[PDB]
Design a binder for this molecule. Sequence first.
Ligand SMILES: CCCN(CCC)C(=O)c1cc(C)cc(C(=O)N[C@@H](Cc2cc(F)cc(F)c2)[C@H](O)CNCc2cccc(I)c2)c1
Length: 375
Amino acid sequence: SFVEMVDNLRGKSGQGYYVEMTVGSPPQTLNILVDTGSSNFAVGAAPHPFLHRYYQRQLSSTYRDLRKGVYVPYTQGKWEGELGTDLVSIPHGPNVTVRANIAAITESDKFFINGSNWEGILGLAYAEIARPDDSLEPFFDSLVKQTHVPNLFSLQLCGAEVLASVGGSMIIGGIDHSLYTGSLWYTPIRREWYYEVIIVRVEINGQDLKMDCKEYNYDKSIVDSGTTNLRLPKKVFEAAVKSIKAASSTEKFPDGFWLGEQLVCWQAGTTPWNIFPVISLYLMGEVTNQSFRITILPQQYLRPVDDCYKFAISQSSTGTVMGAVIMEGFYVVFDRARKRIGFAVSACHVHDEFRTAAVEGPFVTLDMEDCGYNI
Ligand SMILES: CCCN(CCC)C(=O)c1cc(C)cc(C(=O)N[C@@H](Cc2cc(F)cc(F)c2)[C@H](O)CNCc2cccc(I)c2)c1
């Protein structure tokens, strides 16, 4: 948790947060998307219309070919590449250098984003979901094994012609207490593959959705910085939108808005935040029958793009995805060492004059274990 690591993240609204890294010898500078939703470290390694620079293996004296192909299919897009290892560093991170697996991207489809300013991706999740298989050690694992950096990292993602620039901090190896206020509440990492968690209750403006909690984790729920929106299973999504619509019934918006397709704008500075309800996600606590809640404001789920916004909540077919808009305003600790994820109100916490993002506990909830999808 270094002062030199504060504000080491940057990006554009809806295009992901990236950190600067160097690869090879001499160091080749590249901006890398911070993704807790995957486990492969990959970098563009061949010309592409959206890439202004890329990894050139031939220029690295420390590059070693692993003579193996690799391919990763995400929800959004996919890429193909060649495996190898090389020295990697994070200029505004711990002062260490490690030899890590690197997938040199040679072919991709709908992966890179025009104007995003990043050229690669850093999968921070576990080996179990790494490709080709779990034998390909993820970056963070290599970092911990090769150095004395504690097995933990934390993310403080902050909110906001071109898209609004965003900023944040990735604290590697510790917790920086100046980045949050109040107490840190922890939910268990259910299984070490994605950063899987369990949601036991969901409220919209204090009103319980009243669903069998298995629905909230229908298939699974994960914490994913590589995805912008809060993605919800069909049944949960419909209930949530229906509730939000009713709360903001004072005004009417096109279906395109609710479908997160088209945007909605208001007279500069008049966005009626008060008509939109807060959303509370109750996460399983470290103790049976005990949970805590993180409360999200509309300033979070209505993403900036007259002031224009897009509805940052959408339907998922692969489980709940607590994306960047949910993480923004909270300090999230990925405590791998104790298999838990912590939440606390961020220093760049979620706004409002009458309301505010919060992390509150405990709340007694019986049978939280039956909320998960049992393989
Ligand atoms: C970066 C923010 C902007 N974008 C992208 C532009 C629309 C989003 O908000 C967005 C939206 C959707 C609907 C899906 C994804 C997505 O797939 N993200 C992965 C990282 C990533 C993929 C990529 F193709 C582009 C990109 F910018 C970011 C993430 O890992 C997925 N984790 C779950 C998982 C599933 C299967 C397999 C594995 I392994 C993991 C990102």
